[PDB]
Amino acid sequence: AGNDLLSCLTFNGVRNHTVFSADSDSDFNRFLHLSIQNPLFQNSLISKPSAIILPGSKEELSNTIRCIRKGSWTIRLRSGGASYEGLSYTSDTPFILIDLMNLNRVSIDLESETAWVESGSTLGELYYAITESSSKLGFTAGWCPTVGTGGHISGGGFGMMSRKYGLAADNVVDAILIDANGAILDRQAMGEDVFWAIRGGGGGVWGAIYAWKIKLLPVPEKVTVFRVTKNVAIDEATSLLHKWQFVAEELEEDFTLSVLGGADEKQVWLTMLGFHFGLKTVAKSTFDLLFPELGLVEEDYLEMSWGESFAYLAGLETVSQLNNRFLKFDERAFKTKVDLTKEPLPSKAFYGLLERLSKEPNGFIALNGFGGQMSKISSDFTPFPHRSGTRLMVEYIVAWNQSEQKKKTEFLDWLEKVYEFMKPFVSKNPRLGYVNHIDLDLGGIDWGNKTVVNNAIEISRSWGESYFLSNYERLIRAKTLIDPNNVFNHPQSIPPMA
Ligand SMILES: *c1c(C)c(C)cc2c1nc1c(=O)[nH]c(=O)nc-1n2C[C@H](O)[C@H](O)[C@H](O)COP(=O)(O)OP(=O)(O)OC[C@H]1O[C@@H](n2cnc3c(N)ncnc32)[C@H](O)[C@@H]1O
Ligand SMILES: *[C@@H]1O[C@H](CO)[C@@H](O[C@@H]2O[C@H](CO)[C@@H](O[C@@H]3O[C@H](CO)[C@@H](O)[C@H](O)[C@@H]3O)[C@H](O)[C@H]2NC(C)=O)[C@H](O)[C@H]1NC(C)=O
Ligand SMILES: *[C@@H]1O[C@H](CO)[C@@H](O)[C@H](O)[C@H]1NC(C)=O
Ligand SMILES: [Mg+2]
């Protein structure tokens, strides 16, 4: 029973747990909602955990998993709670939520220039700790400070420094994984196939990552960034985006130029985000040469520390704000979809995308170029396969607040239609995806369904090959090795072999 679970936890010295309560403002509901970053999955109709456990050490994490298995609960692991589909805190079967928020220690070793990072730590907490320790070290990961390292690194982790240094997972050199039996496994213990699989094979599949050991990377004491919003009409916005794609993928590895875009009837807005590993004179000379159409001026270019640049690019007020995991931002529900491209987008693709954005001010797009180091890493170095030959990543987002809930169906329909419009221009056979941008539209396994489970491998190939391409086969072997009994599962987890 739940009381048996409780007894087991006590016997093993795990004290931080809270059982389900109907009391709307119970401590249970407080802990549950503390790390739900998408209000979309926050209402009273959604599944709720039977209990929430907050392990405070690797042994407590090991024993929690050990105890949960003596019952029939589904395990859910949550770090940052940023899952696009709420997969860290929802389940169609009774589940126990293992919340890792107390595992938030970052330990920087300046003598080896590496760090051990407990998996409950956020990217912001990590960046803050790095900046505090050194003005010449940084790390490559995503641009959202509130995202958890647990899910993020497990899925790869792309950001503004990836053209220089690759994904967060491409820079992991050891890890502690707690397996289905509660074993505490470092890189040597888990073996090279499993150490490969965890570095981008997706969270919630292999076991519970207790901590990541990462290599810290050189950054100059001052870098140059810009964040400039152009307010233009569609003719100019189209020509800017069409040229942007070439400038972006082609830039030397020491430069990144990304875009956020949206519109409202005749007014289009494009926010250009620039990063250069170096000083402003070189930064401006490069963009003056390659992209004069942007109309950037001297005062747009800002020199600041690496830590400052990551806080700045995230729209935070100060570096100090990096260190606040529960610092919200906005309170909007959202849905997103993503594409990867292999061929240049024709001008008419950007034109049509902007036309659709112009009709839906709640929608917007995020555009990133690959190339640089992303084209120099082999497709099977880690599970993330989209390397050489991949040109852009394109994200489509629609977001709304409480007062707009009536339009929910309308927003989702808009996003569906945008995705359908882009189909001919983006990757095909299969239409590629990214596991950190998990998308349930592709389908999902009901692990309680016998006929589906028998055919799990074929069925799962739909999303599996989209996220991992030819790396799918090795992932299945790693899964069978580390979690043959499928203790760690969700609608799109890698299936073990029968
Ligand atoms: C910005 C924002 C605001 C969001 C919401 C997502 C972002 C983002 N910016 C990104 C970026 O710049 N670059 C990216 O590559 N991705 C970006 N994303 C997506 C984000 O990376 C993913 O949502 C990421 O998976 C979130 O990680 P998280 O905050 O830890 O999310 P969850 O706790 O919901 O977990 C996700 C998934 O992993 C399993 N999990 C969590 N912790 C685990 C440990 N320690 N071990 C094994 N598995 C773990 C969860 O169970 C769930 O399945
Ligand atoms: C289980 O874990 C939760 C989350 O860490 C624990 O709640 C936390 O408890 C600490 C104190 O032990 C709180 O620290 C202090 O809170 C007070 C009041 O807000 C403040 O004055 C101090 O400066 C400091 O912030 C912390 O707020 C709190 N975190 C949350 C989110 O509630 C809890 O104590 C643990 N439960 C057990 C049984 O140990
Ligand atoms: C199992 O899944 C299939 C396909 O999703 C569905 O048609 C069927 O009804 C399910 N079987 C049971 C008994 O739930
Ligand atoms: Mg009450």
Swiss-Prot record:
**Which keywords appear in this protein's UniProt record, sorted alphabetically?**
Alkaloid metabolism, Cytoplasmic vesicle, Disulfide bond, FAD, Flavoprotein, Glycoprotein, Oxidoreductase, Signal
* E.C. code: 1.21.3.3
Q: Where in the cell is it found?
A: Cytoplasmic vesicle
Residue ranges spanning the membrane: these are: none
Question: Has the keyword Cell inner membrane been applied to this entry?
Answer: no
| Molecular function as annotated in GO | FAD binding; reticuline oxidase activity
Which cofactor is recorded for it?
Answer: FAD; a metal cation
Q: What is its main location?
A: cytoplasm
Checking PANTHER family in the record gives: OS08G0158400 PROTEIN
The name this protein goes by in its record: Reticuline oxidase
The taxonomic lineage of its organism, from the top, reads:
Eukaryota, Viridiplantae, Streptophyta, Embryophyta, Tracheophyta
Corresponding gene? BBE1
